[PDB]
Amino acid sequence: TKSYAETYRLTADDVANINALNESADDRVTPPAEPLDRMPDPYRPSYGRAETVVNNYIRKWQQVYSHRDGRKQQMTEEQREWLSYGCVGVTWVNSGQYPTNRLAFASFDEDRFKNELKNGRPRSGETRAEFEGRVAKESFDEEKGFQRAREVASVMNRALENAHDESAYLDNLKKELANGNDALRNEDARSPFYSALRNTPSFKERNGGNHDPSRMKAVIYSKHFWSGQDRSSSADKRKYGDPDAFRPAPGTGLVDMSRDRNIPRSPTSPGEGFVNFDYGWFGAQTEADADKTVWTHGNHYHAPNGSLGAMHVYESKFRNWSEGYSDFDRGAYVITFIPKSWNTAPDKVKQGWP
Fold first, then answer.
1. Is 13 annotated in the active site?
2. What is the C-alpha separation between 184 and 253, in angstroms, rounded?
3. Superfamily classification of domain 1-354
4. 278: annotated active-site residue
5. Are the C-beta atoms of residues 353 and 40 closer than 8 Å to each other?
6. Which is the catalytic residue, given 14, 242, 260, 278?
7. What are the start and end residues of every segment in region (Disordered)?
């Protein structure tokens, strides 16, 4: 299907600039402060997605998502700086940390993969590596992967409910997993799964979790990315994908994200480039129907006076999000934690502004 660059009319320079910034920590600009008394401009969803210029998004975020212990606050200079990075900025601000992606889930149909590889055939004009990459891509199920993350997040939330130290949380978590015959029960003590809470910087902060699990909430976001990131191996894997990379462990659905290096797909035709990743913020919406949930994501980093243009923040229904692009053949559903006292992951998220 269409590339990110084709969809947004990004030039080769645009793509190179996006990739360069996304691999680091037409220059990026920090949007200025928006006063609390400046109300957002109205905007409305169209065909599953709403979008607004980043300055207006800051206004909306300040009215709704900014709350700490129930009270609004201006998005700080540092937060506006984070936000300005684009794709990643929304997730960075809402979680209060640059995404590590350590605890990640996906759903892969091994049977369909094996079958299509044996009984199927490369399309007329398709190379071997193109065929294998595509079949691997199609064998993921993002709805099932998201559902897995939600199920594990609910289990993790129940475990922290009345737990006032990490040991109590871990004890609740293990008992819960044992009872449900979940393969996650058998993860090592230092695994990303078991260490996710204590790995969260705000868990330790006096003003955040203060080492008290009950003060925290599990939250979910998604990363879309490229499977073929090994610049030392075959050009075929770089351009067409690595069928064996970033597959979920069959027992648990856990994806090992340690080899993710923010490296984009190699061009398949000269001039036509790919962006390295996309991030989509879900948070903790109560809506049971996955297709009704809202995923928040900026289009690219903020360059209001340059070729790239001002950053615009999109609020997309899940199907709009999971559609993806030719740039990405992998999706991970990541769990992390934030203090309950924040409001960056509310029960209901509404597209636009009335």
1. no
2. 9
3. Protein-glutamine gamma-glutamyltransferase (3.90.1360.10)
4. yes
5. yes
6. 278
7. 229-269
